[model samples]
Structures are given as C-alpha cells and as structure tokens.
Target chain A: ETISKKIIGMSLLMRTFLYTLAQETEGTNRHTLALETVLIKMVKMLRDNPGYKASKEIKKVICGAWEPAITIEKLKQFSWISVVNDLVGEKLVVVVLEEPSASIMVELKLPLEINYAFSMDEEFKNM
Target chain B: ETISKKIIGMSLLMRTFLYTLAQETEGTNRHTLALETVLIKMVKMLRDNPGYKASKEIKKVICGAWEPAITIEKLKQFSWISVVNDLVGEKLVVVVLEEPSASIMVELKLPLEINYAFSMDEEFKNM
Candidate 1:
C-alpha cells in the first residue's frame, strides 16, 4: 500500500526527488553512467526550459522514463565517447512528429561505425 | 503545467484507466503481446488481491513498467510458446529481497535451453 499511497499523494517535487534518488543510486554503475548522463541532461534541459513547446505534464513521465533508457542503452556500446558526449551536450530538440500515435515508432537517426563513441558497439551490431 | 497538476491531483482511479487504455492500445502489437500479457496479468493479480504484501503504490509504477518490459522482451524470442505461456499464467511470487538498496540488483532464476518457449532468443544470446 505504500506505493498506492505515494500515487494518491503524488507531487511533482516528490516524484522528482524519488526519481533523482533512484537515478543517483541505481544509475551510477559502470555500464549505465553514459546513458544516464544523457537522459538526465535531457530531463534537466526540459525542466529548466519550460518554454519548450510540449505539455509540462510530460515532464514527470519523461523523468520516469530515464531508467528504462539507461537500461536499453547499456545493452549496446557506441564507438566514440566524443560523439556520444556531443549528443548529450547538444540541445535536445523535440518535435511533435505527427502527433502521438496509439502506438509510437522510435526512429534512431545516428550513424553506426567502428570505434566512434556514437557508433554501435560490435556486440550490439551483431545482435 | 499539466503534469504538475496531474501530480498534485493524482488519482489511483484515473491512472488505472490511463494504464489500461495504454495496455490495450499500444500493447497488442505482435512483438509485445507476450511480455505485456505477463506484466498486465501480474498487475491484475496484485490489484485483485490486496493481501499480497508489497505497496499498492507500486502498482502504478509496475503498470508503467509494462511498456519497458515489452520493449526489452521484443528484442529476443523465447523458445517454446507453451513454456512461455505457462510462465505467464503462473503465480507471480513477490519477495522483498533485503529491503531496497541504494542500488538494487535483479536476479532471475530460469533455465536456458533450445526450443523451450521460455528459452532466450538466439539474437539475445549473442548480446
């Protein structure tokens, strides 16, 4: 019932605190830091810039989404740390891309190559 | 912001409605059906039986979690449909392992084999 209580009493500040705590705790592993950094940066940017056109309602959901992205990113390695870093540091551009569908399709617009921090890992490539 | 409002006005009943709609709409795709089915069943079981010890507050989070699991599960295939079905239909046992740690580790106990519905997919094996 603890979770139910939290849900019923949900507050943006509290959930943000919880998610940040979870990320700091669970997100610092060797394999996850890069991706977690990227995601947190994205969330922080949006959080800091409310003028970005999108439902402010999405911030909590987006924050909640950070963990899964870290998990997914860990499954593959990118070739160049520099490129990955650049991507993370770059402004996160959000486009409404055809309105949200009942089922959404994710398109990754990145180059895959050897030894590029942004490139796919060999293992991920094989998969 | 809409999310801020939602967070402040959070309601179990409304979130339940949103989650169920998300499941039925986005979860029926070919790749996600199994994992989504498993997660939804788990949520349903827990929702239906409040006696099972954990926090009811966790239910929304778990329901929220179903999408990520589906995405992860789709990256690979299980060997036998029957075994997969059995696992999905089986009772979802919950045990809080030594309380939550700053960092939590999830350990899955399952057998790996060829052509077993519960077995990992070939592609996943390489990853």
Candidate 2:
C-alpha cells in the first residue's frame, strides 16, 4: 500500500532527478535516459552525499535502489520521482522504447515539450 | 488495475474540470470546491452536451460517476480527472478539509498556487 500511495512535496529530488537525467544526455539531440539509471544515480548521490536527503518518505526506495527490482519501480511509481514526473515527465519525456514491457524502465527522451515547459513555467523551473 | 494506470493527454478534461471548479468558487479568495461536485458537473455536461466526448477510455468512469462509491474516487484517481489533478490539482488545489476520510472527496481550496502556476505555465494555460 505504501508503494501505491501517491508521493507528496519532494521537488528537490525531481530537480536533481531531471538534472541527472540531463547529465546522461549532455551532447546529443533527441537523446534519452533510462528512468532506472537516473534514479540509481539519485540513490547513489544520496548514499555518498546526504545534503539533499531532507525528505524522509523516499528513504526506503533510495536506500535500497537498483536497476532490476520491484523497489526500482516503486521509486518510479511511488517515490518523489512519480510526482515529479507526473507534471514534467508526461509533458517532456516521451517513451522512446518499451522493449520487454511497460512495467520496466526503457528509454525516455527529452522532447521539445521540455524546452517548451521550461520556457513557459517558473514553478517547474524552480522544481 | 485499469483504475491504477496513469492517465495521458486529456487536457480537455482537466481544463473543463478546473474551469468548472473555477465556476464553483466564483467569488472569494481562499474559496474551495468539492472535487466530486466539479466532476459531477463535468459528467453532466458530457451527458447533456457531448461536444468534448472524444476520449473513450474515460467514458466508463464518467458514465457511472456519482457522489459516493469507488467510481468517484476512481475518477479522482484514474480518470482524466486524476491526471487532470495530477498536474493542476496538486499545484492549484489543496486539501482544506478531509473530515470523513481521504478516500472520499471533501473540501478542496484553490490556493495562491493556482495564480502562481497559471502565471508561470503556458503549457498549463493551454491545458
């Protein structure tokens, strides 16, 4: 039930999440990032550096993050990443590939919508 | 499982949803709207005037909407209403009252965030 409950108030993680995802595709156009990779990086950064670890609800998913597991999905579906992506991801990131299934993370690309959203939204930029 | 699946690209519903909700608290600052009331009106508009009846996936939830029962919550959680709220609802509306339970729709206020969000987001404005 905890995993299914919607996340609340964790913009910092999403800012970092998107920033790391941005890091993954630094020099390419129509480039993409694995949801899992960005999240794992987020978890590792938390593990190595605890400065942005203010939010407590996401600890379980972050503390035990991985590439292939239920927790990884939980991080995407139930963690701050979910809420963060709820607005931005739906608008900005398009699913480029869902090879094995939609249940697993595949390739997600930063489309024109990302630039559109950033150009237009201060709240999103603040996030 | 259908109810839990995240909604995609139904800004018409959210636009109508928020506009109708905007209709409810037409006068005062800090005024609130019932998530159920706004949703019920949207359903009625569709039933009486079906102009915006393009999306098929939400018909089931809209077709059987009511004040109570799991469907109302599902509309809030799964229907266009859910995704509608996912972006605007989370940013604009806040839980002012949750007397009976969080399961049922209660008093929801359109906060200052609505103004802030609208001023900041062109995508949200288009939605």
Candidate 3:
C-alpha cells in the first residue's frame, strides 16, 4: 500500500514573488513583507543589478503582469494586484494591512524556512 | 555578500505530472513518461481513490483545464496537452516521441531525484 504525498504547485507570479523576496530579504530577517510595492521595486532592481541573475523567463512573467496595470483601466489591473492575494489564499503566508498608505504586507514569522526552500530548489538542479 | 540561488517555478499542470508519476511508478523507476495519456488516467484515478489527497484547488485546476477540451474542437484541447510541452520547454524534463503510437514520452533518466522533490515540498510546510 502506497502512502499519499502532498503535491505543491506555483505559477509565474508566485515565482516572481519568491525570487524577488528571496534576494530582497536575507539571513532570516523576518518583517512586514511588503508586496505590490515590493514587487514593482524588484522589477526596477532587476534592470539595475547584474548579480541579480534575473531570468528572461521571469522578466517575461513580470511584463505579462504589467500589461494589466496599464491597459484594463487608468487605475490598476486585477491581473497583477491579485497574485499577492493568490499567494495569501494559497496558505503559504499570512498578511496584515498597514494602517497608513495601506500596504498588503505579509507577516514573515517563518522566513528562514522559506529561504531554505530556495536552497532546496537550487540543489534540485544538480541531480 | 549573499550567494545567489535558483528560484524555480512550476504551474498546476506541472504538479499534476509530478504527482501522477510519483505514484504511477515506484521507487523512481525510469521509463517513457507518457503525458497526455498519463494525465487523463490520473484524473480517473483521483475519482476512484480516497487515500489520494486530491485537493479541491487541484480539482478546480483540472476542471479549468478540461473546459478547453470540450469547447474548442472535437479533436482535443491544447490546454491539457501543451503543459507537457511546457514542462519540456522549462528544461525540467526531456521527452522523445515514441514510435508507432508516436507518444510524447519523457526519458526519465533521473526519476529518483524527481520523486525526492515531492519529499522536499512535503517537508516545506512543517516549518
């Protein structure tokens, strides 16, 4: 009798968050993980930094997300803004709203474990 | 200076392949990894088995994939079939077309490590 296993899934937007956050934060420094704001910041940083190793595929995903921010309305696009909610809905992390400026910031109680996940994936390529 | 890392990304369909294959074969036995065929079969198996933890989110993704199949033409749906190609394109896998039946089968020379990937994800939630 074979036991079942928990199968995980993630999309381009999810990876963008993970990658940007992985580099943006370091050494298990847990704090209010500001997304939406942090995400756009990551894109700008990618263009400026070379050691960043920003994959074209990831950049493409970023562009794909940005289209909605410009087109759908002069205001904002659901396509990009919603992914942070997607990440939250997926139970990967919990977030609280900022009082002023109202940012959707995730409470990173387990930052170390999440960083280790990136390490696991890095090791995954070896074999 | 923080060391750079590879932030891997995968979609719902990717997990579908991983989970199905993990159970379909035992202890990382490498062989022709038939996708389109194996995928449909997995959908069927999920309906039949209970020990299999088929999350509703996964089921929803499967149904979302099934729509294009029925609505598009009588032939088949690209939504479900193309994911295998995406998997191949992502370089996570390599598949060669089978002769006669002409099945798109992946040459899984490294199956053991792939299954271990699931193990890593399973461990990810604990922390």
Clashing pairs for model 3 are none
Give me candidate 3's interface root-mean-square deviation. Answer: 11.5
| Structural similarity to truth (TM-score) of each candidate | 0.21, 0.29, 0.36
The collision pairs in model 2 are: none
Residue ranges of candidate 3 with Cα displaced over 4 Å: A1-127, B1-8, B48-54, B61-78, B122-127
Candidate 3 residues A33-120, lDDT tens each? 6765555655554444433323333332222222322121211222344555655664555677878987778654344555555554
Tens digits of per-residue lDDT for model 1, B1-21: 333232223222222222332
Q: Which parts of model 2 are misplaced by more than 4 Å?
A: A1-10, A28-30, A53-81, A88-90, A99-127, B1-127
Number of backbone collisions per candidate? 16, 0, 0
Give the better candidate number (2 or 3) by lDDT. 3
lDDT tens digits, residue span B1-127, model 2: 2211111122334444554565556676445655667677655544444333322223422222211222343334324434334544435444444468654342334433333333443323322
Q: Name the better of 1 and 3 by TM-score.
A: 3
lDDT of 2 by residue, A1-127 (tens): 2211111122334444544555556566445655667677655544444333222223422222222222343344324434334535435344454458654332334433333333443323322
The alpha-carbon lDDT assigned to residue A22 of candidate 1 equals 33
Q: What does the lDDT read for residue B49 in candidate 2?
A: 40
